[PDB]
Design a protein around this nucleic acid. Sequence first.
RNA 1: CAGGCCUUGACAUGCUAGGGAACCCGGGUGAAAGCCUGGGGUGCCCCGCGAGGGGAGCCCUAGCACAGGUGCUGCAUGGCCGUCGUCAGCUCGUGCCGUGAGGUGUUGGGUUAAGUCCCGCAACGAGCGCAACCCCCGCCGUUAGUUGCCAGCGGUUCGGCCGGGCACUCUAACGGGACUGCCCGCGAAAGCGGGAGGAAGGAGGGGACGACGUCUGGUCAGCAUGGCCCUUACGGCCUGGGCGACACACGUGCUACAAUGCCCACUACAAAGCGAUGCCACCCGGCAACGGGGAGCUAAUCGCAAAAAGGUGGGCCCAGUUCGGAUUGGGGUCUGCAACCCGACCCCAUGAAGCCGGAAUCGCUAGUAAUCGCGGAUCAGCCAUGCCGCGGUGAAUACG
Lengths: 64, 98, 206, 60, 84, 24
Amino acid sequence: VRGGGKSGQIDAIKLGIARALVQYNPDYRAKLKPLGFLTRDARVVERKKYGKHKARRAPQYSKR
Amino acid sequence: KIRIKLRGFDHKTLDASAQKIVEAARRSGAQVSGPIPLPTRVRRFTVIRGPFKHKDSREHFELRTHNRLVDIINPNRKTIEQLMTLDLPTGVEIEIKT
Amino acid sequence: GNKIHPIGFRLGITRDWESRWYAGKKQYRHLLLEDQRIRGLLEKELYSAGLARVDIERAADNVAVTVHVAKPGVVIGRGGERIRVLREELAKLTGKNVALNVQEVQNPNLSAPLVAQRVAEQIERRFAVRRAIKQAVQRVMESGAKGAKVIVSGRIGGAEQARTEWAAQGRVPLHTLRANIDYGFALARTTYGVLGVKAYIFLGEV
Amino acid sequence: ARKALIEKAKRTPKFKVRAYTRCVRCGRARSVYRFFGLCRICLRELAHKGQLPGVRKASW
Amino acid sequence: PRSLKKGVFVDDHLLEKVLELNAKGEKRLIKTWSRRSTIVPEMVGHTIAVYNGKQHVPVYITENMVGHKLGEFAPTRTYRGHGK
Amino acid sequence: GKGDRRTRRGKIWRGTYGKYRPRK
RNA sequence: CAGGCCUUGACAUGCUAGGGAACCCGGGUGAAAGCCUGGGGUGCCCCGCGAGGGGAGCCCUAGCACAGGUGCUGCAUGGCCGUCGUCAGCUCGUGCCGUGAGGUGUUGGGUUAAGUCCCGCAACGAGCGCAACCCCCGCCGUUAGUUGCCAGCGGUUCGGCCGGGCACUCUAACGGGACUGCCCGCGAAAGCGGGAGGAAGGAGGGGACGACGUCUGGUCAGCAUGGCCCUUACGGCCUGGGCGACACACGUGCUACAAUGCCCACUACAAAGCGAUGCCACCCGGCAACGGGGAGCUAAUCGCAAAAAGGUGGGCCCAGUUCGGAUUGGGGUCUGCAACCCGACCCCAUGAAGCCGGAAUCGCUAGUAAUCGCGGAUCAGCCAUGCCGCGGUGAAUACG
Ligand SMILES: [Mg+2]
Ligand SMILES: [Mg+2]
Ligand SMILES: [Mg+2]
Ligand SMILES: [Mg+2]
Ligand SMILES: [Mg+2]
Ligand SMILES: [Mg+2]
Ligand SMILES: [Mg+2]
Ligand SMILES: [Mg+2]
Ligand SMILES: [Mg+2]
Ligand SMILES: [Mg+2]
Ligand SMILES: [Mg+2]
Ligand SMILES: [Mg+2]
Ligand SMILES: [Mg+2]
Ligand SMILES: [Zn+2]
């Protein structure tokens, strides 16, 4: 396990395990997938856009 | 045991060059350590779009410098004969050091 | 205030640079100044010939320089004596021992940079802006092209209230990042102020 | 930019702390980039023309 | 909590100029622009005049103010209050 | 907190090193 | 801004000329700039016995063409930008309608994120725009292995260290992959709902990209440019001061008011960057900033680096406190010619307001907000809590 944080690693480890499980017995999918363990969570840190403070956090204005 | 380090702004200009340096020396001597990629260093330039005020304009620029390795071990005259003679790329700067 | 440079917008794609030379983190700000210094002259002592692009390559104190022109004869010189004057007077800017070239423009009607110059030219004389534009759009369209567009800005006709004349034919899809649209701009010093002149030429696509 | 003020080109400054920068092209000073010797404005212009080799539009 | 290190700076304009005065007597007023100079024992007793950036002011240098940079006794701003 | 220049975080914040935040 | 100072002037081209003209080192005065002066000191092509006569580069002075002006006009302008707004629009050609301005098309019915698509229709089409072509992220394959690794074996000073291996991770170049293709239902069609397979599903997430026009929008102090204006000064040098002033008012932020916390110790997970007079391992001196020495790296193979939040343990015990660090006194490091005005950092002392904020008001719909730390440009140093960007942990809620 390398990269990220331990919370992220826990999840990756969870994928790897779910995956190997399938090699051992392909027939596992049919029951291992309804839980989605075989899905690669694509949620990721959003780029920090200029103009805004954090991709989205928008600077505030006074008496507009 | 010569190590070649090719760099350039254009990735295909290297892919091109590096490929040659391999196919060439792939005869007169060893088959080379194979051309290796190597991470790319990247320059960023964030410049306010317009002159005067408008601190929120910006526009992003970047100068990406690519790298390669090749690495030829076991030089045999002709191995170096296929080199010094045949050259081409312009956007490719070479570094040969054993 | 909008619209990206149509060229800069597609450098990665359909559009190579006008200076292509390897790395250099300690000399970049020197070769560049040079490339500039270069273009300096070339975009002067080479105007009347159709200076439509000055490419430049390098490789250790060796400059290429490829001046593209519509009238190379004017570049070369009588029998070929000026291209000799350039080269020398040129290496006076930089030692380097730099080459030179003169590739011609096969039909300047499809060269945006040139078209800009023609229209800016007439304006500088005193032609009817609107006309100049309509005609140029025509020529460019007249000699092939899938689309064309010209834009003169300033105090059109010496008027006091600045305006902007349009004119365009066929397609000029500035958004389609792959169209391959040649862009060109031309100034226009006048008895009463400047006038910008923009030319867009759409060629093929893929 | 005053022609007069482009004295900076005088590599002869009483003390090196007085030596500043200035744009190679427009002669600016307010925000010049070492790697280019150009100011933020001049850099975008040249950049766009494709006259800055390897330089390009960053997207991601 | 000031700082300098090792070399307590003094512009030899007035330094070499002040030690020469010691060799003899005291010259009434000594206009200087070396606002940056550090006061030293020798200067004591003298009367260096420093620039505001507008005027030269008479500053009787004492033994209890040695070390303080010159000027610093020659205020720049002209403020007498906003009141009215 | 980050405000106190003579504590671990104070240093980290000011990005400095010293008695309160040794360079290890 | 004050004072000292220069004038063809700090920078371009050119003419007339008393007249030395190349060059080089000092002295005097002064804050500096400048000003006065001594003085090693002219070859050059050419006429000539020579005294000497004359031109060229360079060179000073007088006088001339002229430089120079961030000096005015963004209501003379180019260029670039902001703005509605990434909103779903704006138009054209021919035809048709109207005496005409104009209308139709672009309206109507379904639908879409969309003038998106379907159906209809005196309109048939087209262009700018929407979408797509490009970049980053999700899965996989090929090519490449000094990154990786007992996956697999052997040796181990047991650090992947060594031999060795390209499997895996990765690095980076190409390529595959999603199209409502497939099943069910509604539908006239587009399309809508649901289901399967799949890393991913109906625009999968984020970027780049911004229509015709709008505002006498912004910028002549980036640059460019018409006109007006100054040309011993509205030009130029220098030294110093000012842009850092304060009784006050507002905007944007930082730190905090504490126990879901503060502190000390031990211990663990990241990404993106940067590095020549540069990053600085390690050692020593110092409480420390830092200093002296000194290896490695031109940087996937060395360094900045310690990630912080987190985990384990221990302290504090509800206090204006072991909360919070303003303010001030003292000592000192480093940069820099120089840190009084006016730098940053270290250490001792001091230890303020502040107990969650009136009327009013802002951001954000998910890997978002919130919170935590890390890098970069500019840059000697730095007033950066600003800005651009990176990854960690990671919600609430949406009837309408
Ligand atoms: Mg974040
Ligand atoms: Mg500076
Ligand atoms: Mg505390
Ligand atoms: Mg305007
Ligand atoms: Mg404008
Ligand atoms: Mg204004
Ligand atoms: Mg009627
Ligand atoms: Mg009719
Ligand atoms: Mg459409
Ligand atoms: Mg689009
Ligand atoms: Mg206005
Ligand atoms: Mg200010
Ligand atoms: Mg939203
Ligand atoms: Zn510039």
